[PDB]
Amino acid sequence: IVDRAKMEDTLKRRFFYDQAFAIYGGVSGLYDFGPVGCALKNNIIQTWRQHFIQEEQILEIDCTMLTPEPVLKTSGHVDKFADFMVKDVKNGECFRADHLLKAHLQKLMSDKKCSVEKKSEMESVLAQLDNYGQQELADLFVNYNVKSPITGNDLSPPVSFNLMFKTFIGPGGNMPGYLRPETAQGIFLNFKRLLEFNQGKLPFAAAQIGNSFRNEISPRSGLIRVREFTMAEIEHFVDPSEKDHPKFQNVADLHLYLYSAKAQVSGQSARKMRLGDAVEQGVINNTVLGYFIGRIYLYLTKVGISPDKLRFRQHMENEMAHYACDCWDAESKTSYGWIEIVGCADRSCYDLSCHARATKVPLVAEKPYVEEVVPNVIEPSFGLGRIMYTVFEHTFHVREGDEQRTFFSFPAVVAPFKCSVLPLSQNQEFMPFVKELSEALTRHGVSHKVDDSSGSIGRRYARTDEIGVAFGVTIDFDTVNKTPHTATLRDRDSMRQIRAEISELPSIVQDLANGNITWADVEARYPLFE
Amino acid sequence: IVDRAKMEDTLKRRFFYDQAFAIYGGVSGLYDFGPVGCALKNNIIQTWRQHFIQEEQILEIDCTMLTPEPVLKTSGHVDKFADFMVKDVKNGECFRADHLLKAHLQKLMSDKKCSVEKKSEMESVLAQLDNYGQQELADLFVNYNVKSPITGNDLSPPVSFNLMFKTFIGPGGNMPGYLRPETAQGIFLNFKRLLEFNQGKLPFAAAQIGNSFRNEISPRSGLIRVREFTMAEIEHFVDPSEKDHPKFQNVADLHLYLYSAKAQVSGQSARKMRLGDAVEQGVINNTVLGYFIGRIYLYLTKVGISPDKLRFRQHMENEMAHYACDCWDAESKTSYGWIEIVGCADRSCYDLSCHARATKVPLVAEKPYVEEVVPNVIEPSFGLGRIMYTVFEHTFHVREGDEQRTFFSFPAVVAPFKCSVLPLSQNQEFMPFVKELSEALTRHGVSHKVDDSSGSIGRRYARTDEIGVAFGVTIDFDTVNKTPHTATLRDRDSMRQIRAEISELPSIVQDLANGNITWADVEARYPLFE
Numbered sequence A, B: 001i002v003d004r005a006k007m008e009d010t011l012k013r014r015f016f017y018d019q020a021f022a023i024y025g026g027v028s029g030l031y032d033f034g035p036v037g038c039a040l041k042n043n044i045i046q047t048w049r050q051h052f053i054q055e056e057q058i059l060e061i062d063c064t065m066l067t068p069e070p071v072l073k074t075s076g077h078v079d080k081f082a083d084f085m086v087k088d089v090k091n092g093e094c095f096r097a098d099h100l101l102k103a104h105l106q107k108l109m110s111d112k113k114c115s116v117e118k119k120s121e122m123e124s125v126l127a128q129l130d131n132y133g134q135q136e137l138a139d140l141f142v143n144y145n146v147k148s149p150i151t152g153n154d155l156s157p158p159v160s161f162n163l164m165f166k167t168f169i170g171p172g173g174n175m176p177g178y179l180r181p182e183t184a185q186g187i188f189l190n191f192k193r194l195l196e197f198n199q200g201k202l203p204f205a206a207a208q209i210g211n212s213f214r215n216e217i218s219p220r221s222g223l224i225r226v227r228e229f230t231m232a233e234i235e236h237f238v239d240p241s242e243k244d245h246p247k248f249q250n251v252a253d254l255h256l257y258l259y260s261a262k263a264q265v266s267g268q269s270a271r272k273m274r275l276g277d278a279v280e281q282g283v284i285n286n287t288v289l290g291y292f293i294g295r296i297y298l299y300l301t302k303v304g305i306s307p308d309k310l311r312f313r314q315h316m317e318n319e320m321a322h323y324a325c326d327c328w329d330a331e332s333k334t335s336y337g338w339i340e341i342v343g344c345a346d347r348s349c350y351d352l353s354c355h356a357r358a359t360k361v362p363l364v365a366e367k368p369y370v371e372e373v374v375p376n377v378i379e380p381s382f383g384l385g386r387i388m389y390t391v392f393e394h395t396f397h398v399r400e401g402d403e404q405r406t407f408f409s410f411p412a413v414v415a416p417f418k419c420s421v422l423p424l425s426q427n428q429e430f431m432p433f434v435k436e437l438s439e440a441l442t443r444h445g446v447s448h449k450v451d452d453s454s455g456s457i458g459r460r461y462a463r464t465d466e467i468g469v470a471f472g473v474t475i476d477f478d479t480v481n482k483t484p485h486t487a488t489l490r491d492r493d494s495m496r497q498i499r500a501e502i503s504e505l506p507s508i509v510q511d512l513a514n515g516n517i518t519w520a521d522v523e524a525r526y527p528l529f530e
């Protein structure tokens, strides 16, 4: 239970993100990222960089965003990629059908005039909605009778609005095109030279961190439903017969909630299995697909998301994307309900065969006499955009003080800046002290900023606290007069401070940030400080 | 004098960059970046990050790429942003007028049937071409008589083809739009909250590193003329009366070539002045504008560009961009002729007033009773795309060996990876040696890779050399048998190797890379090694 009001405010006011073209109304689905937003956004992508590109030796490439029609035609996006959009025959007013109807019953079932009878099946319609194809979706629009959420007029019938953007490369129009809704298409169109790198063998994974434009229909969800976002997609290319990952055991232990395709049509709550097990019972197919799920879960933990509001729901027989057959998602419970943050498909051999075909060009690899195979790609797609947002809710807190102060609890690995050094007075009796302390941290690799904004030591930290800043070091007179020189080490969450000598602090904020010492351990080694 | 053939090849073959949608023909102006390309591209942006955002405390923000018409209408892009495009009335075939004509005379003057007479003025037409407005450009198309470079048909008349891309945000078309051809527009539309950060004072600079789409007409220049590129733009906001930079003295010494607006209409060669001087004589207006020129020059040096093929040419009275009045460029001499890599405008108060107007919203700052001013922005725009390319030529070399090997000479600060450790045999008598050496480097922060590709120690380095890899460490038997254990330290450029004990090497590759020791100094401290 989080409070959107007080956060969307604290966020926007502290310029994490805010509506683009503000001074023009602001196009919905389009938001900009201020400084502390960028600092956070870069720290999330710099972690995601270790966690994957580093650890698993991932081949990186930066592909163009401007795509020519033929390429998206072959993948079959020009076709099946879109959302059902209706609209009241009064004025234009669009609406992603899907959701509109999902809001109708969420009004009936919630209204107390419901029959313990009805209520139980409208749930059976919601939990089966992404499945409903063109027809059933057209029908249901008659039944429950849908009518514009604003001034209830009469919505036309459900239609397939393609989400891709559209433009022409070069002058004229002989070369129409689109704005790549996903990155991968590029990782594949490059397959040959990407195979090349890994000596022609498999497994070998590729990747890309960049933009993807998705002209949504009714962007009303804030940072969750945007028309342009930064996402990172990995294209793990493994043998169709070797679907057995050489590391899986490092992530089988993990006990993550799972909500199989059966635990859905078999209307039952998700379970908190184990991975080494969930794969046993035939649920999570092979092991590769389970390993990435393990990592995907560690990253999401490491960056902020909390164990409790994260689950993995496989799709439904035809809730499938046009390019896959199997597939799992990382859904994060939030004020908008469970939403996916890290889609993880299993698009067997689709994409690669479709392209090799249409271009009459050969796309294969070989194994040991030596047979040719079409690798089976397993794509773990991350939408940093939403991943950041989940981190914002899961860590938002309101300190218990009538004052109404707020502090985010970001892991030291993503906070705008780890430590925030602050002295009382700004004279030369403090400088030769503050100076050192900054460089000494610099050396230790503890990202920081020296506090200048005036206010009581305590009001100063209210600011440091709002943007999640991990730790703080208070440098008062006693640090500049008493000898040894002791400073104040304050843990953002507990506002509890420590008093340690000043030249030892940098190595302390370090061990603290890296997860090489608890806050409790400090209170135990050094003296407290109310 | 560089050789495009042998490089465009070595580049593309080593997947630095290559045509996008290869297996489809490849849309010109659109290229992708392979791994060693990305590694280089990221190292250039990570340097540019220190050099500017770090040093000058630059406020960063990440703005959207999708822009709604009204915003680009107010800046006046919907109007004056474009290139003159003709086309032979036979078939479509476009052509940026500008250049087509510039290729015609570059054929007349070069053809030996020229009069020492004519030749001298066609130069007077080329050196004054960006100036020629709609008319004179229409006229000259009659004179010199321009006719399609391919199957000389008859080109229509010169017209204003707007370069911006075009699309509709949301379903319908009630909200048309474009793909931001530059970033800044965003930095301005955010002015208010950006002022806020710096306590409402000036100077204070903003910035953005991201994409910009520029639907060129005849992308035929490779990586130099692309339809989509990553660029970084800084928006330094200083007082219209304080145009005097608080650091300029740190960059006045520098002796960089300058080619004033007068040294152009006064048809005379560029000069190799000094900055503290060039500003004296009234050429380079104030000092801010000169400081950034100093930095802009250091970065371009630090990353690769060579002093000699870099100059700064101010624009011509009406070669101006629609948003500026004064302006300098960083042109880099290359196989395509001097081309600009780092545009540096002085767009006084244009952009900010235009927006504050159209939106009826107030955009100002105050100084000490306390008057309101419209800061004067000074924009240093970097096109990493072309900056990378200049680095590719300026450092391409062919080792003197009939064999035809090539090695780039990237400053250790941008090479795919600094050191490249390589052992002969792959057994356990080498591991406990290679292992250490990697971590020991890891600790020292010397990005590296262990050589696996088979071949003679020497053929191995041919590879390390092609992608510019800074240094190499050869680990042979004598390192694993003789004691002390000595390795081989090889300097990419001179192929000259050193023999030093192995546990001391990591700190050596370090000092070497950081510019804290010459290669000569090694040959002096340690023993050689043919």
Ligand SMILES: Nc1ncnc2c1ncn2[C@@H]1O[C@@H](COP(=O)(O)OP(=O)(O)OP(=O)(O)OP(=O)(O)OC[C@@H]2O[C@@H](n3cnc4c(N)ncnc43)[C@H](O)[C@H]2O)[C@H](O)[C@H]1O
Pocket: A080, A081, A082, A083, A130, A131, A132, A133, A214, A216, A223, A224, A225, A226, A227, A229, A231, A318, A319, A320, A321, A322, A340, A341, A342, A343, A381, A382, A383, A384, A385, A386, A387
């Ligand atoms: N029977 C059927 N036939 C055809 N289509 C059917 C169908 N049933 C359901 N559908 C679905 O309806 C469409 C709705 O798409 P979307 O509008 O993109 O939203 P989504 O389904 O909630 O995310 P998705 O799961 O598609 O993300 P993706 O794999 O592309 O890529 C990964 C995601 O990218 C990011 N992302 C996607 N959209 C985003 C947005 N608008 N804002 C921010 N991030 C976004 C997410 O963070 C990340 O998880 C889907 O394309 C299609 O699968």
Ligand SMILES: Nc1ncnc2c1ncn2[C@@H]1O[C@@H](COP(=O)(O)OP(=O)(O)OP(=O)(O)OP(=O)(O)OC[C@@H]2O[C@@H](n3cnc4c(N)ncnc43)[C@H](O)[C@H]2O)[C@H](O)[C@H]1O
Pocket: B080, B081, B082, B083, B130, B131, B132, B133, B214, B216, B223, B224, B225, B226, B227, B229, B231, B318, B319, B320, B321, B322, B340, B341, B342, B343, B381, B382, B383, B384, B385, B386, B387
């Ligand atoms: N009288 C007149 N009236 C109106 N317009 C006139 C004119 N006389 C000349 N012109 C010029 O004609 C147009 C040609 O533009 P472009 O097609 O973008 O090429 P340019 O002039 O060589 O680069 P420019 O100097 O414009 O780069 P910019 O400041 O935008 O931004 C910085 C640059 O971005 C990068 N960049 C720009 N285009 C690139 C491309 N196609 N590929 C790669 N990088 C590019 C460069 O690296 C970097 O220096 C210019 O917009 C306009 O000024």
